[PDB]
Design a protein around this nucleic acid. Structure first.
Lengths: 136, 94, 58, 76, 117
RNA sequence: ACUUACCAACCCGAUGCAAACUGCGAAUACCGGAGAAUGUUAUCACGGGAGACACACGGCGGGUGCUAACGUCCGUCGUGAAGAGGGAAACAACCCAGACCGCCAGCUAAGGUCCCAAAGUCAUGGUUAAGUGGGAAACGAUGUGGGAAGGCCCAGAC
RNA sequence: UCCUCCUAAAGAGUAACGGAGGAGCACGAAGGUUGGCUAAUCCUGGUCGGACAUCAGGAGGUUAGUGCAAUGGCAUAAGCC
RNA sequence: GCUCAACGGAUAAAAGGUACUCCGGGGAUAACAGGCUGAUACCGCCCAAGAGUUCAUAUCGACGGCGGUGUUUGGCACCU
RNA sequence: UGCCUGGCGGCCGUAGCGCGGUGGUCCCACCUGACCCCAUGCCGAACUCAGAAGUGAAACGCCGUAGCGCCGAUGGUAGUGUGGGGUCUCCCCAUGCGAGAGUAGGGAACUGCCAGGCAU
């Protein structure tokens, strides 16, 4: 479960999530799972999806994870008449914009890798596509 | 040999260039060597099919622009950042 | 020197304060008031700021 | 300890801008450090408040090795 | 850091002061073999008078070019040229050289001849 | 003294993230000066008299909350409050628009024109077969229309 | 009650039982002026001496310092003698 | 000469109880029912590692994902 | 008028850092010595004075080099003022403004006052 070792600040603003992604190209590998929509991967989601594609290649290959959950997210506990400060940090997220590559693979063929990233896609909340590397 | 037709552009800028990708064209530029840079526009489907082949980026190409052939290399290419499309190509003169 | 005609098309209920001033600056009052002004750079720029709610007959 | 606390706003910043004509004495910029320095006809106060020593129009510019922003003046 | 840059570092505060005052300044430049002196305008580019132990009118007279008795001759010379051109008030820029010995002896010979500082 | 399939600071290359990071950096806004036109002096100063200091919703920028609430707290604009008329079935706060009075005159706004109900069962060319229109997701599926390439084919393809 | 940063929407100002920290002093020098000076850290050599102490040289360039939070400043030093 | 620090400082000088209670007010503000919301709750679907001697889906279903209902615990304070 | 050096500037990395080459008649630097002026919390290292036997090694200056820095269009993209629209956590249309990164490319600064020296 991914989570920075230490930060400056425990808690962070909510922010927004507008605009398109940096990190659009498949650099590290041959293939990749590009996002098409727009949301947050939790850290549990990112892991569940790695364990799908890892299982599915039988450990051939290499897998890179391009996104990291570094925004923290608070919840108030149950019954909390509002106010009395900001809540505790429950869990961590990456924010995803349309066009971010999330996973990359090489050291398998395009038969198998399509099936691996289909099995990951079912664990993630955002709509995704398969991409191959472009030479320029 | 990879042949492309083109047109010189009347308009340009955000408003103009978004109207082109509505009309299945897209804008590109020819610069490099000596002269003034040139602004051009290209059928999207033609040049999508061509740039599938990896010889697009090695070879010299041949842009017809009001009769005059020009010989150019594919220097740079902006992709639309999820759908498989193109938003712009820089063509250096060779 | 050479006059132009400017007519108020839409109401100025619920506009910005800036635009309501710009109309008073053209001397427009109600809907369908037509008004004769000299054509400078500076009049043309008022007309551009409220284009949506005016209309120009050369 | 929890939070709850902030100080009162000290209304710093530029007061007179370039072009603007001033009277000797007029403050031109309050500031914590020297984001701006004093050029011609201008005093650094002791809190680095910058003020006219003569009447005239304010001029900003950049100067010297380090590219520092000087406020100076054109006495009319 | 060589000696020339360290000497300029020493000099720089004196000189930035003398800009904002808007003063005419008597710059001096000592060397082991020689000693020079210029009077420089309020703007800080254009020179009004000069003297030195190279320029031959003064070199002919002297025993040796770089000692106290040279400098007393040069400090004499700059005053007598500056007073012709209507320059009484100056401010003595020692240019990163201790006020002492050879540079002192230049200045005190310019006060003799009536150049005011 | 020797080998190491183990962690690997720094440097090097590629790659992301930041309210409390910035070797960059808009639009707007704000300050100042000059110049037309326009506006019932709309600016400022000094006196007499107040009321008010429980605000609300809508849009945009944010904090908080679960990017829950007709929630809550700032910023900025609008309307209501103190505003009738027309539209949104009905509907303070949304869209249009500011009612001095009268008329059994006319032109338009938003929104409309089969009947209830004022006005097109108007014209031209397509789409849908689900009453979709007229409540909603991941995901599913030889539903059906358009577009651009690709492979296979009278050497007999599916 | 006061000070600093963010929230605060590139002038100022701007709320919440929003997010982070400080103060309720010190100093006749830690003030004034004249003159001079330039940091941290790491590497190499060297009695006791070791990862760490005084000495020498090199790399490095303020990553240091600024009585005390934070921010903005600071080499003409506002740092050091 | 004041930690008059509740820091624009009610006095030089001040703590509790009421189920024995009283008056004036408030739905400006709580308990109860309604309303908005749906974190929680309940019901369902998607993915399918694995269990089921062999076999993912007869029966189950980890890691995760998308909904419905308005039924529970709440949140808000609009009604009284 | 040309070449070279010194001082004071303007300008602030297109101007800098490195790498290689080169300059001593003057200039400049190191350099020689120190009872005296002065100096070291020890030291003529520095500062200072009295000098001119030696040297351009270091330093400084000039020339060359695109290795590192530095500057840098056109186009497109992002953002956004006003008006309008949506499937409204986010976008699209008309219109006005329009980055940052990157690309081509540029680039081994340019410029003033005074002094001195060599050549003509």
């Amino acid at each position: 479960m991914l989570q920075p070792k230490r930060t400056k600040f425990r808690k962070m603003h909510k922010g927004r999530n507008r605009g398109l992604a940096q990190g659009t190209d498949v650099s590290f590998g041959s293939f990749g799972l590009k996002a098409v929509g727009r949301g947050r991967l939790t850290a549990r989601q990112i892991e569940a999806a790695r364990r799908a594609m890892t299982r599915a290649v039988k450990r051939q290959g290499k897998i890179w994870i391009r996104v990291f959950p570094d925004k923290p997210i608070t919840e108030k506990p149950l019954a909390v008449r509002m106010g009395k400060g900001k809540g505790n940090v429950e869990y961590w997220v990456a924010l995803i914009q349309p066009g971010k590559v999330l996973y990359e693979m090489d050291g398998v063929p395009e038969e198998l890798a399509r099936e691996a990233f289909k099995l990951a896609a079912a664990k993630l909340p955002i709509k995704t596509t398969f991409v191959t590397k472009t030479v320029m | 040999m990879f042949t492309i037709n083109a047109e010189v552009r009347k308009e340009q800028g955000k408003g103009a260039s978004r109207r082109l990708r509505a009309a299945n064209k897209f804008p590109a530029i020819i610069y490099g060597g000596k002269e003034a840079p040139l602004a051009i526009e290209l059928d999207h489907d033609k040049v999508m099919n061509m740039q599938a082949k990896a010889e697009f980026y090695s070879e010299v190409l041949t842009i017809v622009v009001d009769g005059k052939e020009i010989k150019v290399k594919a220097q740079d290419v902006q992709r639309h950042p999820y759908k498989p499309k193109l938003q712009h190509i820089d063509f250096v003169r060779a | 020197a050479k006059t132009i005609k400017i007519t108020q098309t839409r109401s100025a209920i619920g506009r910005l304060p800036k635009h309501k001033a710009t109309l008073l600056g053209l001397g427009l009052r109600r809907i369908g008031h037509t008004v004769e002004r000299e054509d400078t750079p500076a009049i043309r720029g008022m007309i551009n700021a409220v284009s949506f709610m005016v209309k120009v007959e050369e | 300890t929890r939070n709850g606390r902030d100080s009162e706003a000290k209304r710093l910043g530029v007061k007179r801008f370039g072009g603007e004509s001033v009277l000797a004495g007029s403050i031109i910029v309050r500031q914590r450090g020297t984001k701006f320095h004093a050029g011609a006809n201008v005093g650094c106060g002791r809190d680095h408040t910058l003020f006219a020593k003569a009447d005239g129009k304010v001029k900003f510019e950049v100067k010297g090795p380090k590219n520092r922003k000087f406020i100076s003046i054109e006495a009319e | 850091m060589d000696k020339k840059s360290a000497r300029i570092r020493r000099a720089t505060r004196a000189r930035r002061k003398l800009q904002e005052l808007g003063a005419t300044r008597l710059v001096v430049h000592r060397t082991p073999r020689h000693i020079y002196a210029q009077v420089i305008a309020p703007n800080g580019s254009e020179v009004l008078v000069a003297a030195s132990t190279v320029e031959k009118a003064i070199a002919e007279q002297l025993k040796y070019t770089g000692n106290k008795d040279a400098a007393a001759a040069v400090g004499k010379a700059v005053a007598e040229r500056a007073l012709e051109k209507g320059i009484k008030d100056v401010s003595f820029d020692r240019s990163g050289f201790q006020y002492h010995g050879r540079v002192q002896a230049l200045a005190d010979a310019a006060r003799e001849a009536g150049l005011q500082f």
